[PDB]
Design a protein around this ligand. Sequence first.
Ligand SMILES: *[C@@H]1O[C@H](CO)[C@@H](O)[C@H](O)[C@H]1NC(C)=O
Ligand SMILES: *[C@@H]1O[C@H](CO)[C@@H](O)[C@H](O)[C@H]1NC(C)=O
Ligand SMILES: [Ca+2]
Lengths: 100, 49
Amino acid sequence: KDMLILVDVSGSVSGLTLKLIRTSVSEMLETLSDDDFVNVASFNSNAQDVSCFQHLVQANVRNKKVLKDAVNNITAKGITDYKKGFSFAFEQLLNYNVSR
Amino acid sequence: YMILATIIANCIVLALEQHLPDGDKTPMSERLDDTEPYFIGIFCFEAGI
Ligand SMILES: *[C@@H]1O[C@H](CO)[C@@H](O)[C@H](O)[C@H]1NC(C)=O
Ligand SMILES: *[C@@H]1O[C@H](CO)[C@@H](O)[C@H](O)[C@H]1NC(C)=O
Ligand SMILES: [Ca+2]
């Protein structure tokens, strides 16, 4: 695979929905092998990477833990923009300068 | 009666609004918040008269 997990951390997901989203993203990462490359991005009126990774990294144990911690540390705030999040996701899937 | 109708319209606009947790806003809330100056203007008009 080449996932970009787009997480919708806007105001409307606060409380239970954010808890379910972060557990779901962790369990989604737990299905990624070492041949899959993954990044996790979050958008609320502007998209950003949840972690220090700026591109699709290999989905090995240590990178997956980095992404899991970044997702667990994520907070809900702001308005949603599905265009600035999908722009970010599609741009990151077109980044061929990195291992994929 | 036009004042009564605009008052009912203001009440309907207030009823139509939805509140989201942490700064999020529904797309319709933007329109229902941009419709305010008409109501404040009509109420200033009744006050002036
Ligand atoms: C990660 O958690 C720390 C500890 O509270 C916090 O200060 C920091 O803002 C969090 N990261 C982000 C990107 O908000
Ligand atoms: C990849 O490298 C090219 C040339 O060095 C650069 O123009 C581009 O911005 C880089 N990033 C992506 C995502 O293509
Ligand atoms: Ca939202």
